[PDB]
Design a protein around this ligand. Sequence first.
Ligand SMILES: c1ccc2c(CN3CCNCC3)cccc2c1
Lengths: 50, 1032, 50, 100, 49
Amino acid sequence: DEVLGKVNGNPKFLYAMMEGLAEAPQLRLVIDREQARTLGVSFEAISSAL
Amino acid sequence: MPLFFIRRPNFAWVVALFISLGGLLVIPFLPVAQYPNVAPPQITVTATYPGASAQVLTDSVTSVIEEELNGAKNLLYFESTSNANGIAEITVTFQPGTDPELAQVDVQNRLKKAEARMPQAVLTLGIQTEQATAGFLLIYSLRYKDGDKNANTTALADYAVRNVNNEIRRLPGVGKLQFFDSEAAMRVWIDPQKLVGYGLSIDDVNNAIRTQNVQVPAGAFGSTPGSSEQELTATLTVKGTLDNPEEFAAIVLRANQDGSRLTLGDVARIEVGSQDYNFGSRQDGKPAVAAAVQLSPGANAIQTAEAVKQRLTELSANFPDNVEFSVPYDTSRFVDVAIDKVIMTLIEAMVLVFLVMFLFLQNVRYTLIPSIVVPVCLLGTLTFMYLLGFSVNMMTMFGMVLAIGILVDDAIVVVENVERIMAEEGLAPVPATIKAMGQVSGAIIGITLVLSAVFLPLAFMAGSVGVIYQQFSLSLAVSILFSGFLALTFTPALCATLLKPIPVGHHEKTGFFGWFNRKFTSLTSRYTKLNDKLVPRAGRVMFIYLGVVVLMGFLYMRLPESFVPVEDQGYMIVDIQLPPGATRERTSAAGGELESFLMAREAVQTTFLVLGFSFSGMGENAAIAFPLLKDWSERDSSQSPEAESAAVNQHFANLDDGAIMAVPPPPVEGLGNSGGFALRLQDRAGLGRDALLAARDEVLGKVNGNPKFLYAMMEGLAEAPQLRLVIDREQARTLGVSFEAISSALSTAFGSSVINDFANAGRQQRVVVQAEQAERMTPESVLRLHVPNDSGSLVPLSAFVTTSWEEGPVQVARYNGYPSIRIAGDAAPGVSTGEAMLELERIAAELPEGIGYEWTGLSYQERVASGQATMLFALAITVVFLLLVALYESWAIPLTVMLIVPVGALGAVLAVTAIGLPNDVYFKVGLITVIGLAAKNAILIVEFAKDLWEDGYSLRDAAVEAARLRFRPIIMTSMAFMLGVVPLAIATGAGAASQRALGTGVLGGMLSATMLGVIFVPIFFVWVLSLLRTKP
Amino acid sequence: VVVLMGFLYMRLPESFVPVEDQGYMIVDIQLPPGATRERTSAAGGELESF
Amino acid sequence: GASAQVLTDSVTSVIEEELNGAKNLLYFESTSNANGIAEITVTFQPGTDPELAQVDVQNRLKKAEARMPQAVLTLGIQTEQATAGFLLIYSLRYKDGDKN
Amino acid sequence: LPEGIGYEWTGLSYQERVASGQATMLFALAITVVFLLLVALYESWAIPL
Ligand SMILES: c1ccc2c(CN3CCNCC3)cccc2c1
């Protein structure tokens, strides 16, 4: 963003833009490994199922 | 053709300036290196089988790859060695001059064909093929300033891999970075006693690690094919792998419904450490790391070395303050010193030829011409050398320094002949040039062709000698080709242009110059009378000449042969081998004492020590040291590497823990681990390991007792006691114990098992599981291990395994597919290597039938060289004869001139025998260029002799006059070449052995070819034209 | 004349290769982060209609 | 189904790091997308035969193969020539223009 | 930019860089070679100038 602000505000170029995908919201899955294990759930089962 | 240029000087000027401009525009792409790829192209296979014995790895992995790599195009041989550390080494060697890329890809193709058979452990660890020998530019090292012993080399190695190695491998010119150490890895040090307490087996901990430390490709909700309604796809990014030891210690081994859990840390100590602990490196008593940087093909060395050093110093700014970098070894410093000295010799030889040029002609303008025509030839030499893809290495710089002499003669004779005509007839410069060049041009073409074809054959031979002679001879030949072209076209124009008229009759002179003119006139007249005195007695001079050729033969056959003189490379080899079964700590103590003593030696600037590696073989008992010597300028002869090696061997002769041996490095890199002879004792019939070792002691008894050899030792690891585990399979099974459980438990507890991938902040390293240091130090610890039965209890190992000791191979060596012993050594001082090879063949003939013997590397190439030299000489002689009969329109005149070369050979042989140097390659090429000069001399006499004797002069009068008017340039060029190559023979420092072997041989041979040739050649002329009764 | 030549030679903007009319164009369809394929298909539908 | 960062540090990182030092490299670009496709482009100096480039890159992918996940391996890694004299593109489409 | 952030050119920019680098001494070598051929042909220097 530093370089893009310094560039797009500079009239020496038509444009500058990330030829690349912008950051996106993600959904982290907080797996209590201990809780899942105590219920008898292997991490292998969760990983395979997901 | 020269007259064309005499009438049009600008044409010749432009052609010469053209070739010069080409030369100048070709240097910026010059490849430089120590030596060319003289060593054969070697590919080396590295297969890792953690915790597998030498024999297991031998018959499980390396045997299969060896089977697959047979019949590959361009094989020369292949060596394999399987060490107890679990690393297999297979070195496939090809004929020199074969492109290493094609060798590499073919070896990879055959490795793939083999890949289906190696165990899962090797495959998951990966098989690596690379190029063990190449232009390894340098080695750069990192070490701790404080010299703390407790320094964690793994943190240093991780810093080097993350920050340093990538930058250097990114640099231009470097074709491969060889990091010579391990990589970080979460270590899982399990305690089998805790596993016993918790009713857990090692497979349980492995499977917990395997399923709980796995990345999770969860995906993203709202993914294609998506509903026409939903519009918010997003990633699921589950965390699956573990980053730090704390997370790994939280791997749940067994959790109850109540809430109680068993985490990995409760049974194992978790830390980040080396993936592999086979090898350790030390630099000057401090734990250090190092990497081998190798030069890409067809690239400058000095520029690449400077780029690496500048990059590394720039990185040293971001370095941790406790760590410091240094570059102990650099192969570009030798080349920088070499070219800077050779340039100095070139300038100082130009000044010498200028000085004697002006001493003879006593006028600067006459002297100028060669000083301009010579570097033009040198620039053309560079352009053509680059065009064929040769490299600017020491051997081409000797091509330079001993070309300068044979090149300078063209200009010397041309300008000196034009002066002789200018003085004796006094014409204007142009018509005098016409006359002299008309006399000399056919002879000059004969020269150019005959020396072209005298070093053409030296370019035909194969082997490492093949490469040396290739470069050195072809540099010489291109030099003489352009020198002849200039003498035909450009230099005559130079005479027609730059020369100034002299007054008629101005032979009276003021000062010591007039003394010189008078004294040389007296010498020329005296020599004229001398010829007039011997030419009647030609049959009698036959007896002296035959004595000369017989003496040449006598000391030539009395001259010990050699491949290449050993050069002071500034480093030594010291081998650290302890008794069989030695732990790394004993080796570290031995290395500590060795490195301390090397500190006490002032001849050593820095000592680099390797633990676990030695050219004999890799193992815990084995280690190697590479002391670095100070620069030659800061050292004297008393601190030469050989003297320092003797000092160390005498010092550590009474070492109480193992053996320390100091061996000077082999002369040619990549042709072996030490100089001398390399012999593989095969068993072409399968007599068995014990029988092969029996033959080994047989041959070593028969050899070490023979005074023909300095020493001979098994370049390999001695047999070590082994602990065979007698597992009652039936008993273990009845208790409910599967063999799978025992095998898995042993492999994981003692051999360490790589479970899965540790995602260490972007690097995929491998979590390793191994038993605790205290729980695997003794044989009883093997018994204390437990394995699970079918009923869920844990069965101690000692319930069904009894340990019985026996003896086995810690290293197995195979050659061309058969089991072999690698025996190596050096001959006694003052004894030829060929005689030692013959003695070894004789002794090996006494071996029991079925035991084969095979030479390898240096010995094999010495063999092919000695084979090829003879018909090389023969082809050279027959071709020079044929060209001579072509040019001279006769047969008698060709034999007349060919009578000259024994005198040059005699001079070279007597000089080298007086100084005692062997019959190395450098002396051989010095001899051939001396022969070339003598042939040039002989033509320079005899073409004018023939010209006179076709003009009506009497045979004796024609010969004597020809010698009289060719005497001056003869001694002229002789003295120029003298003082041009005198620095070569007196050379000291880097590469000095090669330069001295040149200088002494060339100086002696050319000394005889002048002092004896100038007298004998007219005698030969009159004899041959008399006895054969030749007619004009 | 030679000075004039130099003066507008150094005043001449450099270029690699002039852009040729290749008969095709590039149009990029990038939606906000986390966009399902269906939104992109609707955008492409409107683009292709135009 | 592997995220951008997972594919980044699990597959494309290993191949990327291992292909360094290859003969005639001019640079190499890598991009890892959430779709689960890793994209690595290795560019060589013009005038080098792309047959030798292709074979060397395949030989290096071979050294990399030992580390990729089982999913990628069973699905397979593919190396080709993204830029070449692509003569044309030919297409098949439905006349009726049915969306379904 | 803050120290540690490196910049690099790729593809078209890299080629434009090397082209702009080579143009000058290419022109120079062309001029010197034509001069040399011209002095060869004309048996003079003044005529080549
Ligand atoms: C100092 C340190 C290493 C040196 C090497 C490396 N060696 C080959 C590869 N295996 C390790 C040993 C060769 C030659 C001179 C050296 C000098």
